[PDB]
Amino acid sequence: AQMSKQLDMFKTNLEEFASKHKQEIRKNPEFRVQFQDMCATIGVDPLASGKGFWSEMLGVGDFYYELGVQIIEVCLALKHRNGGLITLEELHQQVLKGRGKFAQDVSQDDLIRAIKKLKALGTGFGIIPVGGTYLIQSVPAELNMDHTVVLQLAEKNGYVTVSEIKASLKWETERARQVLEHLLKEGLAWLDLQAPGEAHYWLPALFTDLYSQEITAEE
Amino acid sequence: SFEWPWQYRFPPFFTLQPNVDTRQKQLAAWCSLVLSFCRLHKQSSMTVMEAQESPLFNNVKLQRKLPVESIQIVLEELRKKGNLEWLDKSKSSFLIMWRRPEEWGKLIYQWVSRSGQNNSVFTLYELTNGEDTEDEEFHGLDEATLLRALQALQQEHKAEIITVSDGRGVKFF
Amino acid sequence: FEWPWQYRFPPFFTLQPNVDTRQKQLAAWCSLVLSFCRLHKQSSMTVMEAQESPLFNNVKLQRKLPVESIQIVLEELRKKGNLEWLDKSKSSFLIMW
Amino acid sequence: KNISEAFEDLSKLMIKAKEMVELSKSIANKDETIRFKSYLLSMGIANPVTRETYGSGTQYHMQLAKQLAGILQVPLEERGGIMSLTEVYCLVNRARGMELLSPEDLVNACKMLEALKLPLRLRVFDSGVMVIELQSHKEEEMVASALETVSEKGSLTSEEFAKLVGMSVLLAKERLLLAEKMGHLCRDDSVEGLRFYPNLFMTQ
């Protein structure tokens, strides 16, 4: 039991640590990040397991593991409008709307934390950097780096246009049109033949409407 | 107080989408909207020309309108779903019934049956506008939808449409 | 000559990823292009020339054989004989009979 | 007020852990090391290229694998004997007050369901999608009926097929791709979408 001696040592240090600093981690966002960011320097993961000590005493497990279920459900309830793509904004707005009298306790950073763990359930979730926020993908699609880049271009107006694809990305016409085709085949874009200049491809994931989300609450 | 749906404010909604899973979705949304726009404006009768210009198929502010071919498509969807009947020899003016006559005649039958009035006569007027009804769903139901209703109820085995006092009648079985 | 049942079969204009199926597909395509050159008589052209030709473009149905996929059926159509590329800059071909 | 009791004594807490970290990576080179995995899991120091070299996973995970066999048996039946892991992860944590499951947990328990001879079984599709199925379920054996469904409708997309058969879009995609792999369906990929048709090439 060469290692087990120092094991029980740590147990009682942390428990005290918990007893006077419980609700702080639960009360202010800025403090969570601190605790977390130091853990990854050490080579420990407080969120890895429910049998983790960190989770057992601090409750960071049941907070985040629960945040994942909520993130899954919001995305599903929404997947029919938007195709399996949601902005981190709208996700946030919705997770809160469904948390109740505790409708502030979660930050954008918390959401992203949780999705990263969700990735371990296998292909499913994905985080996509755009301009100054993140898009979250919740249904599978393929590697096409070409698909990311267009998403990123779409982000500035909620739509995209072949002429715009070619000029901004310096791409061949077939290549632009091909990715467009994928956006249509997946339900992430809808075509618009009444737009100034030429056809526009609009993504419901972008496009602000702040309403409803019921009928699809049945998963 | 009817609200417009998120689709109505989304430019693409106004174009027949080529992807087939999206189109099914587009069209379920158009159908749901026509029915609920009529239900709200209490209209049961319009024309293709008459409709083509409503704020139903024309978002003036968004600067998009649903083309004629595409509306002929949604009208045909409703027709086969049972909500729309053409009433002019050449496909031009139509009856629009926000609830299906089948569900109608059923509700009406239920009301008749849990009334202690199971074997007796009603004028068309009494059912839609009477004192006895008031608190039912079919109060204020336009004459035509009421006919289809009883005409479906006849075609089953539950009602015969008569001729009564000095008017249009119906006996319930 | 007279159009084969495949030409009315939509999946025929997408390259099948199943290897058994692709063969039968690839074959049927060779059998048709060598067969068509009786009607139009001409025996030679380029990539873009075929794109608006009825052998690769069924309008009453929908879809056409993608340019990329044209290059696959061609390779087989060259390594069967009945073809040569007439330039080393990769474009334009000689399809025999 | 009491946050400065944290910010500091937290910076110290890390040193205490770091010792269990530093002097445990040296312990890598030579119940055997079963206690070492329970020792590791409690910390949260994963070590796959040493842990899973000798000693697989944890006995906690094991205790949990049998938990789930009971939990999921009927829900699986109700859903046609197959669920994606993410539907499972919801089914399980939602039906709990506290002491929930991490994604790794559920995944690791699942990973040994087989060696444990329990009736459920974790599969991984080539999409990378993880799934759980009952002893009695094989997608391979479902491929006949998929082809039957496609033929009755002429042809159909993944979505259409999912709606008709009452299954999730994800699982329907897999089912049809598999039937394609087996030469029962061919594909028709257009702007209209990715349709599956009977494999008329392998007939006629």
XYZ file of C-alpha atoms in Angstrom:
693
model
C 0.000 0.000 0.000
C 2.866 2.359 -0.914
C 0.562 4.800 -2.767
C -2.647 4.277 -0.737
C -1.210 6.094 2.311
C -1.004 9.394 0.415
C -4.430 8.621 -1.062
C -6.343 8.988 2.227
C -4.187 12.049 2.933
C -5.695 13.882 -0.020
C -9.284 12.835 0.767
C -9.420 14.869 3.991
C -7.587 17.930 2.578
C -10.123 18.323 -0.210
C -13.176 17.755 2.020
C -12.193 20.710 4.190
C -11.423 22.641 1.008
C -15.001 21.841 -0.026
C -16.738 22.626 3.266
C -15.876 26.361 3.278
C -15.728 26.902 -0.510
C -18.781 24.870 -1.643
C -21.184 27.421 -3.153
C -18.439 29.715 -4.547
C -17.804 27.437 -7.551
C -21.609 27.284 -7.844
C -22.044 31.094 -7.351
C -19.588 32.883 -9.683
C -18.487 31.828 -13.224
C -15.030 33.479 -13.079
C -13.954 31.224 -10.207
C -14.848 27.938 -11.931
C -12.408 28.605 -14.781
C -9.582 29.193 -12.302
C -10.029 25.836 -10.542
C -10.415 24.101 -13.872
C -7.493 25.746 -15.720
C -5.078 24.715 -12.962
C -6.222 21.077 -13.057
C -5.121 20.581 -16.693
C -1.620 21.855 -15.806
C -1.415 19.164 -13.111
C -2.694 16.430 -15.457
C -5.988 15.809 -13.651
C -9.581 16.044 -14.873
C -12.240 16.899 -12.245
C -14.919 16.074 -14.787
C -13.568 12.738 -15.970
C -15.595 10.623 -13.529
C -18.389 10.453 -10.964
C -16.008 8.299 -8.912
C -13.597 11.221 -9.098
C -13.055 12.852 -5.716
C -13.390 16.333 -7.206
C -16.860 15.523 -8.441
C -17.826 13.574 -5.314
C -17.001 16.456 -2.944
C -17.223 19.550 -5.145
C -20.211 18.524 -7.245
C -18.683 19.645 -10.537
C -19.731 16.288 -12.010
C -23.487 16.421 -11.362
C -23.474 20.054 -12.557
C -21.815 19.384 -15.923
C -23.001 15.781 -16.592
C -26.495 17.310 -16.114
C -25.648 20.252 -18.371
C -24.931 17.671 -21.095
C -28.381 16.111 -20.887
C -29.896 19.579 -21.149
C -27.680 20.456 -24.087
C -28.654 17.254 -25.815
C -32.368 17.941 -25.324
C -32.336 21.565 -26.491
C -30.516 20.566 -29.675
C -33.073 17.867 -30.441
C -36.122 19.986 -29.773
C -34.473 22.448 -32.223
C -32.910 20.078 -34.793
C -36.045 20.330 -37.038
C -35.879 24.115 -37.508
C -32.175 24.356 -37.923
C -30.646 21.064 -39.147
C -28.381 20.228 -36.187
C -26.524 23.510 -36.029
C -27.081 26.054 -33.315
C -25.219 29.205 -32.293
C -23.684 29.129 -28.795
C -25.863 32.146 -28.111
C -29.220 30.461 -28.812
C -28.178 27.269 -27.036
C -27.370 29.408 -23.998
C -30.616 31.349 -24.208
C -32.523 27.978 -24.282
C -30.676 26.002 -21.668
C -31.439 28.956 -19.388
C -35.106 29.195 -20.409
C -35.437 25.592 -19.265
C -33.384 25.701 -16.084
C -36.081 27.657 -14.157
C -35.635 29.771 -10.964
C -31.985 28.908 -11.535
C -31.854 30.641 -14.959
C -28.498 32.317 -14.603
C -26.171 29.780 -12.936
C -24.704 28.651 -16.357
C -22.167 30.481 -18.575
C -21.152 30.087 -22.221
C -17.976 28.539 -20.974
C -19.899 25.958 -19.033
C -21.711 24.909 -22.196
C -18.509 24.386 -24.140
C -17.029 22.497 -21.254
C -19.930 20.074 -21.398
C -19.924 19.561 -25.174
C -16.204 18.599 -25.006
C -17.206 15.745 -22.689
C -20.117 14.828 -24.886
C -17.691 14.078 -27.720
C -16.760 10.914 -25.876
C -20.212 9.452 -26.645
C -18.872 9.103 -30.145
C -19.545 11.016 -33.300
C -22.352 13.423 -32.498
C -21.306 16.797 -31.205
C -18.822 19.273 -32.617
C -17.732 22.820 -31.932
C -16.972 25.146 -34.858
C -15.149 28.440 -34.441
C -16.576 31.398 -36.364
C -16.055 35.122 -36.205
C -16.412 35.791 -32.533
C -18.418 32.912 -31.140
C -18.895 29.116 -31.745
C -21.372 27.013 -33.684
C -22.453 23.740 -32.298
C -23.086 20.792 -34.408
C -25.181 18.036 -32.845
C -25.715 15.681 -35.745
C -22.924 13.883 -37.606
C -21.428 15.193 -40.807
C -18.089 14.596 -42.578
C -14.635 16.137 -42.415
C -15.036 18.594 -45.366
C -12.750 21.459 -44.155
C -14.563 23.128 -47.040
C -17.760 22.866 -44.988
C -16.247 24.621 -41.988
C -14.879 27.446 -44.066
C -18.296 28.171 -45.619
C -20.041 28.047 -42.275
C -17.509 30.695 -41.219
C -18.272 32.825 -44.213
C -22.045 32.379 -43.755
C -21.772 33.685 -40.275
C -21.491 37.293 -41.199
C -24.870 37.680 -42.869
C -26.719 34.453 -42.085
C -26.505 33.524 -45.777
C -23.909 32.739 -48.428
C -23.766 33.215 -52.233
C -21.694 31.454 -54.954
C -20.259 34.803 -56.185
C -19.341 35.575 -52.611
C -17.811 32.150 -52.004
C -15.599 32.468 -55.066
C -14.356 35.978 -54.315
C -13.744 35.616 -50.603
C -12.263 32.108 -50.673
C -10.791 32.256 -54.164
C -12.504 28.960 -55.063
C -13.587 27.342 -58.298
C -17.296 27.541 -59.089
C -17.950 23.794 -58.925
C -16.304 23.632 -55.550
C -18.567 26.345 -54.126
C -21.673 24.856 -55.656
C -20.712 21.394 -54.262
C -20.530 22.580 -50.658
C -23.848 24.455 -51.227
C -25.291 21.150 -52.362
C -24.175 19.616 -49.089
C -25.763 22.355 -46.994
C -29.081 21.732 -48.830
C -28.798 17.899 -48.561
C -28.276 18.146 -44.855
C -31.041 20.656 -44.081
C -28.617 23.322 -42.949
C -29.403 25.728 -45.702
C -32.550 26.648 -47.680
C -32.434 28.209 -51.146
C -33.802 31.653 -51.939
C -34.533 32.538 -55.557
C -35.894 36.060 -54.847
C -32.727 37.636 -53.555
C -30.960 40.632 -55.055
C -28.149 39.739 -57.428
C -28.437 35.905 -57.515
C -29.548 32.901 -55.400
C -28.735 33.134 -51.653
C -28.389 30.136 -49.321
C -29.703 30.966 -45.862
C -28.977 28.957 -42.721
C -31.848 28.784 -40.165
C -29.176 28.132 -37.474
C -28.156 31.770 -37.860
C -31.209 33.960 -38.380
C -32.638 35.390 -35.179
C -36.105 34.480 -34.024
C -36.563 34.430 -30.252
C -39.667 32.216 -29.869
C -41.530 29.051 -28.700
C -39.665 25.643 -28.892
C -42.721 23.527 -27.894
C -44.428 20.533 -29.629
C -40.856 19.195 -30.154
C -40.269 18.809 -26.396
C -40.973 15.058 -26.874
C -37.284 14.434 -27.911
C -54.627 36.166 -31.251
C -52.818 34.189 -33.984
C -49.042 34.661 -34.317
C -47.101 34.355 -37.584
C -44.696 31.399 -37.622
C -40.844 31.780 -37.716
C -40.895 30.486 -41.340
C -43.033 33.375 -42.521
C -40.174 35.756 -41.694
C -37.431 33.631 -43.334
C -36.840 34.589 -47.005
C -36.314 31.005 -48.286
C -39.772 29.935 -47.012
C -41.083 31.666 -50.100
C -39.211 29.385 -52.589
C -40.106 25.731 -53.484
C -37.120 24.042 -51.873
C -35.363 21.488 -54.091
C -34.172 19.252 -51.310
C -36.968 16.776 -50.724
C -36.809 16.456 -46.883
C -36.823 20.221 -46.600
C -39.727 20.527 -49.013
C -41.906 18.150 -46.984
C -41.202 20.448 -44.114
C -41.776 23.656 -45.984
C -45.169 22.368 -47.082
C -46.318 21.073 -43.758
C -45.566 24.627 -42.554
C -47.518 26.346 -45.368
C -50.520 24.093 -44.825
C -50.504 24.736 -41.123
C -50.373 28.463 -41.796
C -53.117 28.700 -44.402
C -55.538 26.761 -42.165
C -54.703 28.916 -39.177
C -54.895 32.194 -41.157
C -58.397 31.311 -42.313
C -59.478 30.077 -38.871
C -58.409 33.554 -37.660
C -60.003 35.675 -40.407
C -63.165 33.519 -40.312
C -62.944 33.015 -44.120
C -64.185 29.766 -45.677
C -64.178 30.837 -49.306
C -61.455 32.341 -51.504
C -60.207 32.440 -55.105
C -56.748 31.678 -56.505
C -56.522 35.313 -57.641
C -58.034 36.457 -54.316
C -55.491 34.442 -52.319
C -52.443 35.195 -54.497
C -52.631 38.752 -53.086
C -53.323 38.167 -49.359
C -50.544 38.913 -46.868
C -50.790 35.089 -46.577
C -48.581 34.404 -49.606
C -46.929 37.846 -49.742
C -44.665 39.240 -47.007
C -44.531 42.806 -48.253
C -41.890 43.875 -45.742
C -39.575 40.866 -46.341
C -40.119 41.518 -50.067
C -40.952 37.913 -50.887
C -44.101 36.301 -52.271
C -44.960 32.648 -52.882
C -45.208 32.064 -56.659
C -48.448 30.849 -58.233
C -47.137 27.386 -59.144
C -45.951 26.835 -55.611
C -49.331 27.924 -54.198
C -51.153 25.671 -56.621
C -48.936 23.059 -54.961
C -49.913 23.846 -51.386
C -53.579 24.208 -52.333
C -53.369 20.753 -53.872
C -51.812 19.463 -50.676
C -54.683 20.748 -48.586
C -57.214 19.427 -51.064
C -55.970 15.842 -50.667
C -55.472 16.208 -46.934
C -59.226 16.900 -46.916
C -59.204 20.610 -45.948
C -59.814 22.174 -49.355
C -62.555 21.600 -51.909
C -62.661 23.147 -55.364
C -66.185 24.429 -56.050
C -65.779 25.769 -59.581
C -65.688 23.419 -62.602
C -62.251 24.737 -63.600
C -59.964 24.935 -60.602
C -60.215 28.709 -59.733
C -62.202 29.385 -56.525
C -62.277 27.108 -53.502
C -63.714 26.255 -50.116
C -61.191 26.326 -47.248
C -62.105 24.427 -44.014
C -59.659 24.877 -41.126
C -60.889 21.655 -39.493
C -61.938 18.569 -41.339
C -65.653 17.818 -41.758
C -65.037 14.303 -40.396
C -63.833 15.526 -37.031
C -66.715 18.078 -37.379
C -69.528 15.560 -37.816
C -67.946 13.501 -35.066
C -67.997 16.348 -32.518
C -71.510 17.148 -33.576
C -72.515 13.528 -33.131
C -70.948 13.422 -29.680
C -72.910 16.517 -28.736
C -76.151 15.011 -30.072
C -75.553 11.686 -28.274
C -74.688 13.115 -24.838
C -77.751 15.343 -24.995
C -80.628 12.905 -24.578
C -81.579 13.916 -28.109
C -80.358 10.849 -29.968
C -83.379 10.168 -32.165
C -84.604 13.531 -33.474
C -84.619 16.466 -35.875
C -82.615 19.636 -36.188
C -82.755 22.571 -38.563
C -79.333 23.539 -39.872
C -79.724 26.874 -38.028
C -80.297 25.396 -34.536
C -76.992 23.414 -34.623
C -74.706 26.344 -35.583
C -76.461 29.245 -33.868
C -78.903 27.829 -31.323
C -79.194 28.324 -27.580
C -78.467 24.633 -27.005
C -75.082 24.784 -28.761
C -73.404 28.159 -27.936
C -70.721 26.403 -25.859
C -69.728 23.895 -28.558
C -66.957 24.116 -31.147
C -69.359 24.057 -34.067
C -71.188 27.252 -33.020
C -70.583 29.816 -35.774
C -69.525 27.163 -38.298
C -70.164 28.449 -41.831
C -73.013 26.776 -43.743
C -70.809 24.990 -46.234
C -68.473 23.314 -43.750
C -71.650 22.291 -41.915
C -73.022 20.612 -45.047
C -69.795 18.675 -45.749
C -70.003 17.678 -42.064
C -73.490 16.224 -42.260
C -72.732 14.914 -45.732
C -69.895 12.878 -44.299
C -72.130 11.869 -41.424
C -74.752 10.791 -44.006
C -72.229 8.815 -46.053
C -71.376 6.830 -42.898
C -74.745 5.859 -41.352
C -75.387 8.471 -38.666
C -77.418 11.279 -40.302
C -79.929 12.075 -43.110
C -80.290 15.624 -44.505
C -83.955 16.623 -44.848
C -86.083 19.710 -45.555
C -87.883 20.554 -42.235
C -90.307 23.460 -41.347
C -89.746 25.892 -44.211
C -86.015 25.081 -44.620
C -82.890 22.854 -44.610
C -82.958 20.004 -42.039
C -81.195 16.938 -40.588
C -82.327 13.840 -38.702
C -79.798 12.094 -36.460
C -79.683 8.349 -35.900
C -29.731 3.032 -80.655
C -32.805 2.677 -78.368
C -32.296 3.908 -74.776
C -31.644 1.185 -72.123
C -33.615 0.772 -68.870
C -30.631 2.234 -66.957
C -31.000 5.550 -68.805
C -34.427 5.823 -67.146
C -33.026 4.726 -63.768
C -31.978 7.727 -61.632
C -29.183 5.933 -59.632
C -27.417 5.297 -62.921
C -26.217 8.881 -62.940
C -24.580 8.538 -59.504
C -21.398 6.454 -59.318
C -22.240 3.611 -56.962
C -19.837 3.135 -54.059
C -20.618 -0.620 -53.841
C -17.891 -2.405 -55.907
C -20.160 -5.149 -57.341
C -22.702 -2.495 -58.332
C -20.163 -0.056 -59.713
C -18.866 -2.727 -62.078
C -22.282 -3.432 -63.555
C -22.751 0.373 -63.637
C -19.355 1.115 -65.233
C -19.988 -1.670 -67.760
C -23.483 -0.501 -68.727
C -21.993 3.003 -69.297
C -19.277 1.676 -71.637
C -21.902 -0.390 -73.485
C -23.959 2.799 -74.025
C -21.295 5.339 -75.069
C -19.884 2.881 -77.636
C -23.501 2.221 -78.729
C -24.569 5.873 -79.049
C -21.817 6.850 -81.512
C -23.962 5.324 -84.278
C -26.777 7.919 -83.984
C -24.615 11.065 -83.785
C -21.994 9.318 -86.018
C -19.179 11.574 -84.701
C -16.411 9.694 -82.922
C -14.436 12.261 -80.840
C -14.871 15.393 -78.640
C -13.951 16.884 -75.208
C -15.097 16.828 -71.538
C -17.381 19.886 -71.848
C -18.760 18.663 -75.207
C -20.312 15.598 -73.592
C -21.756 17.590 -70.629
C -24.598 18.960 -72.826
C -24.936 15.743 -74.845
C -28.047 13.487 -74.409
C -25.869 10.425 -73.639
C -24.833 12.030 -70.343
C -27.767 14.434 -69.850
C -31.356 13.244 -69.370
C -33.533 16.351 -69.074
C -37.037 14.821 -68.908
C -35.853 12.816 -65.948
C -33.302 14.850 -63.971
C -29.567 14.868 -63.092
C -26.539 14.300 -65.314
C -23.249 12.393 -64.926
C -20.915 14.642 -62.884
C -17.771 15.811 -64.745
C -15.597 14.078 -62.148
C -17.420 10.807 -62.782
C -17.063 11.281 -66.528
C -13.308 10.896 -66.013
C -13.793 7.469 -64.425
C -15.938 5.920 -67.199
C -13.476 7.389 -69.693
C -10.378 5.783 -68.159
C -12.081 2.377 -68.478
C -13.160 3.357 -71.978
C -9.525 4.046 -72.863
C -8.091 0.974 -71.154
C -10.662 -1.063 -73.099
C -9.236 0.463 -76.242
C -11.734 2.735 -78.051
C -9.945 5.873 -76.765
C -6.807 8.012 -76.661
C -6.094 11.463 -75.246
C -4.882 13.731 -78.065
C -3.003 16.112 -75.707
C -0.727 15.825 -72.644
C -2.347 18.819 -70.912
C -5.310 16.574 -69.963
C -8.440 17.691 -71.901
C -10.157 16.468 -75.136
C -10.206 12.844 -76.332
C -10.627 10.360 -79.206
C -13.502 7.882 -78.681
C -13.612 5.226 -81.443
C -16.332 2.606 -81.993
C -14.276 38.097 2.486
C -13.846 34.334 2.058
C -12.787 34.081 -1.605
C -9.161 34.858 -0.617
C -9.269 31.809 1.639
C -9.856 29.986 -1.653
C -7.629 31.614 -4.311
C -4.610 30.877 -2.149
C -5.411 27.590 -0.365
C -6.522 26.409 -3.812
C -3.093 27.196 -5.288
C -1.666 25.053 -2.454
C -4.201 22.229 -2.906
C -2.693 21.626 -6.363
C 0.775 20.938 -4.937
C -0.775 18.215 -2.732
C -2.348 16.550 -5.785
C 0.757 17.065 -7.929
C 2.632 14.697 -5.593
C 0.172 11.881 -6.281
C 0.676 12.803 -9.954
C 4.486 13.125 -10.291
C 5.136 10.027 -8.173
C 2.722 7.706 -9.999
C 4.059 8.118 -13.543
C 7.283 6.530 -12.261
C 5.080 3.681 -11.007
C 4.477 2.819 -14.704
C 7.673 0.897 -15.514
C 8.335 -2.771 -14.665
C -5.398 -7.778 -7.805
C -2.039 -6.702 -9.252
C -2.468 -3.092 -10.397
C -6.256 -3.228 -10.047
C -5.953 -1.090 -6.900
C -3.835 1.307 -9.027
C -6.761 1.915 -11.417
C -9.106 2.630 -8.506
C -6.209 4.736 -7.255
C -6.117 6.487 -10.657
C -9.863 6.907 -11.248
C -10.350 8.717 -7.929
C -7.728 11.287 -8.931
C -8.762 11.638 -12.548
C -5.295 10.956 -13.902
C -6.049 8.897 -16.975
C -3.226 6.752 -18.335
C -4.488 4.728 -21.381
C -1.088 3.624 -22.758
C -0.256 2.067 -19.342
C -3.664 1.472 -17.751
C -5.047 -0.341 -20.807
C -1.681 -2.054 -21.377
C -2.168 -3.957 -18.115
C -5.465 -3.937 -16.204
C -8.074 -2.792 -18.798
C -10.583 -0.562 -16.865
C -12.129 -0.402 -13.381
C -14.282 -2.689 -11.230
C -16.529 0.284 -10.544
C -17.231 0.363 -14.280
C -17.871 -3.366 -13.986
C -20.386 -2.941 -11.130
C -22.021 -0.363 -13.326
C -22.192 -2.458 -16.491
C -24.610 -4.852 -14.784
C -26.598 -1.906 -13.466
C -27.307 -0.851 -17.041
C -28.203 -4.322 -18.337
C -31.244 -4.181 -16.051
C -31.904 -0.465 -16.621
C -31.991 -0.605 -20.439
C -33.534 -3.998 -21.202
C -37.119 -2.711 -21.705
C -36.290 0.728 -23.056
C -34.242 -1.135 -25.723
C -37.132 -3.398 -26.535
C -39.330 -0.352 -26.947
C -36.941 1.179 -29.415
C -36.341 -1.826 -31.561
C -33.388 -3.299 -29.691
C -30.888 -0.525 -30.438
C -30.039 2.943 -29.074
C -27.272 5.384 -29.851
C -25.057 6.071 -26.790
C -26.263 9.649 -26.570
C -29.907 8.582 -26.293
C -28.684 6.155 -23.632
C -26.711 8.742 -21.725
C -29.959 10.800 -21.519
C -32.180 7.890 -20.634
C -29.924 7.155 -17.622
C -28.927 10.514 -16.081
C -32.406 11.999 -16.504
C -33.873 9.165 -14.333
C -31.628 10.164 -11.389
C -31.595 12.855 -8.708
C -27.858 13.073 -8.062
C -24.771 10.826 -8.486
C -24.998 10.988 -12.289
C -22.741 9.410 -14.964
C -19.919 10.992 -16.941
C -19.751 10.214 -20.657
C -16.444 8.304 -20.001
C -18.172 6.321 -17.238
C -21.055 5.136 -19.322
C -18.650 4.492 -22.188
C -16.214 2.468 -20.083
C -18.931 0.411 -18.399
C -20.273 -0.272 -21.891
C -16.830 -1.304 -23.130
C -16.839 -4.516 -21.021
C -20.504 -5.478 -21.354
C -19.282 -8.171 -23.727
C -16.552 -9.803 -21.644
C -19.175 -9.804 -18.887
C -21.552 -11.946 -21.054
C -24.480 -9.616 -20.288
C -27.249 -9.449 -22.942
C -26.493 -5.856 -24.168
C -23.507 -5.060 -26.371
C -21.781 -1.826 -27.462
C -21.170 -1.470 -31.201
C -19.335 1.199 -33.101
C -20.341 2.004 -36.669
C -17.776 3.132 -39.259
C -19.362 6.623 -38.946
C -17.878 6.562 -35.427
C -21.348 6.459 -33.941
C -21.545 4.320 -30.823
C -24.602 2.363 -30.094
C -25.979 -0.254 -27.741
C -27.984 -3.304 -28.765
C -29.631 -6.319 -27.278
C -28.187 -9.800 -27.588
C -31.019 -10.622 -30.007
C -30.510 -7.636 -32.391
C -28.391 -7.562 -35.571
C -28.682 -4.744 -38.084
C -27.549 -7.310 -40.710
C -30.771 -9.212 -40.172
C -32.821 -6.003 -40.478
C -31.623 -5.317 -43.979
C -34.268 -7.527 -45.647
C -37.139 -5.501 -44.205
C -35.391 -2.274 -45.080
C -35.310 -3.361 -48.722
C -38.976 -4.336 -48.518
C -39.761 -0.824 -47.272
C -37.853 0.928 -50.032
C -39.548 -1.242 -52.702
C -43.047 -0.587 -51.460
C -42.280 3.190 -51.819
C -40.300 3.174 -55.039
C -37.351 4.899 -53.342
C -36.608 6.990 -50.279
C -34.272 9.278 -48.292
C -32.991 8.472 -44.794
C -35.499 10.907 -43.263
C -38.470 9.513 -45.137
C -37.564 5.992 -44.143
C -37.138 7.011 -40.456
C -40.598 8.610 -40.365
C -42.254 5.577 -41.942
C -40.600 3.003 -39.768
C -40.599 5.074 -36.595
C -36.881 5.172 -35.841
C -34.365 7.925 -35.485
C -32.805 9.546 -38.533
C -29.287 8.547 -37.364
C -30.112 4.895 -37.072
C -31.977 4.807 -40.352
C -28.972 6.231 -42.185
C -26.820 3.377 -40.856
C -29.408 0.819 -41.704
C -29.653 1.908 -45.322
C -25.901 2.364 -45.848
C -25.494 -1.189 -44.621
C -28.089 -2.529 -47.007
C -26.164 -0.690 -49.733
C -22.855 -2.255 -48.524
C -24.608 -5.606 -48.910
C -25.819 -4.765 -52.430
C -29.488 -4.597 -51.629
C -29.989 -0.859 -52.337
C -28.207 1.523 -54.739
C -28.045 5.288 -54.434
C -29.394 8.256 -56.291
C -27.631 11.343 -55.172
C -29.005 14.642 -56.398
C -30.052 18.102 -55.319
C -33.305 16.406 -54.389
C -31.243 14.471 -51.868
C -29.673 11.117 -51.271
C -32.249 8.508 -52.208
C -32.040 4.750 -51.891
C -33.459 2.536 -54.546
C -33.623 -1.256 -54.933
C -30.418 -2.515 -56.554
C -31.804 -3.066 -60.039
C -28.226 -3.450 -61.364
C -27.975 -6.752 -59.404
C -31.271 -7.806 -61.055
C -32.551 -7.372 -64.666
